[PDB]
Every structure is written in structure tokens, then in C-alpha cells.
UniProtKB/Swiss-Prot annotation:
This is Protein AF-9. The YEATS domain specifically recognizes and binds acylated histones, with a marked preference for histones that are crotonylated. Also binds histone H3 acetylated at 'Lys-9' (H3K9ac), but with lower affinity. Binds crotonylated lysine through a non-canonical pi-pi-pi stacking mechanism. The YEATS domain also binds DNA. It comes from the Eukaryota. It is found in: Nucleus; Chromosome. It is linked to A chromosomal aberration involving MLLT3 is associated with acute leukemias. Translocation t(9;11)(p22;q23) with KMT2A/MLL1. The result is a rogue activator protein. Fusion protein KMT2A-MLLT3 interacts with MEN1 and PSIP1. The lineage of its organism: Eukaryota, Metazoa, Chordata, Craniata, Vertebrata. Chromatin reader component of the super elongation complex (SEC), a complex required to increase the catalytic rate of RNA polymerase II transcription by suppressing transient pausing by the polymerase at multiple sites along the DNA. Specifically recognizes and binds acylated histone H3, with a preference for histone H3 that is crotonylated. Crotonylation marks active promoters and enhancers and confers resistance to transcriptional repressors. Recognizes and binds histone H3 crotonylated at 'Lys-9' (H3K9cr), and with slightly lower affinity histone H3 crotonylated at 'Lys-18' (H3K18cr). Component of the super elongation complex (SEC), at least composed of EAF1, EAF2, CDK9, MLLT3/AF9, AFF (AFF1 or AFF4), the P-TEFb complex and ELL (ELL, ELL2 or ELL3). Interacts with BCOR. Interacts with CBX8. Interacts with ALKBH4. Enriched in undifferentiated hematopoietic stem cells in fetal liver, cord blood and bone marrow. The chain holds residues 490 to 568 of 568 of the full protein. Signal peptide: none annotated.
Amino acid sequence: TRLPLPLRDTKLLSPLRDTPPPQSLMVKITLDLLSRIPQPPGKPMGSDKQIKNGECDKAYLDELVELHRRLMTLRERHILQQIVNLIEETGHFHITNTTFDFDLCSLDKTTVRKLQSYLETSGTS
């Protein structure tokens, strides 16, 4: 009677998928305070190549991580349009009528440099 296993946190999760995507940090901007909602895609379109990258453990991640944050503390509008459209031109973002995110660690490193830039119009330091 609950002698061996008192009580676990979470039982069996969804159908154990085969080597499913990893886990890290993603950027999600409330769909409410967005206003603009990019139109959905046309044809399914789904590659299969997926080049095996090698982020490896380093430190540069710190930057990307911090970014996601400073992004959450954004409330000036007008810019969101420059963050959604910019990527729009290049798929790789999940859209939803109630949420929308994307991965900045996937697209070229240039896209990240641009974003960070605007995210600092004033003049930190």
C-alpha cells in the first residue's frame, strides 16, 4: 500500500515518441497584444534533410538566452511587426490564433544581430 512508491509527480506522459525534439528556450509573444496575425501557409511543404548541426556546449548561448528575456519585457508595439514580418520571409516559426513563437538559434546569426540592435534604440551602457 504505497510502500515502495509513495506518490510520483507525473505518471505516463503522452505516447512515448521516438527520439522527439530536444528541450531549450523559445520566444512566444502574446497573440493578444500583437494585432497583426501573419496569414497561414499554402501547401503542407515538409522537407526531411535536417542537417545535423553541432551547437555543442560553449557559452554564446548566454546571449541568446538573455535575449529571449529582454524580449518578454517589451511593450511598445510597432516593433513586433518588424520581428514577425522579418522572419515571415523565412519560414521556421509556429503560428497560432492564440500564440506564436519561433527559434532564433536556427536562422542565420545575422537575423539575431539585427533584432538585438533594434531592441536597443536608446543606448545601453
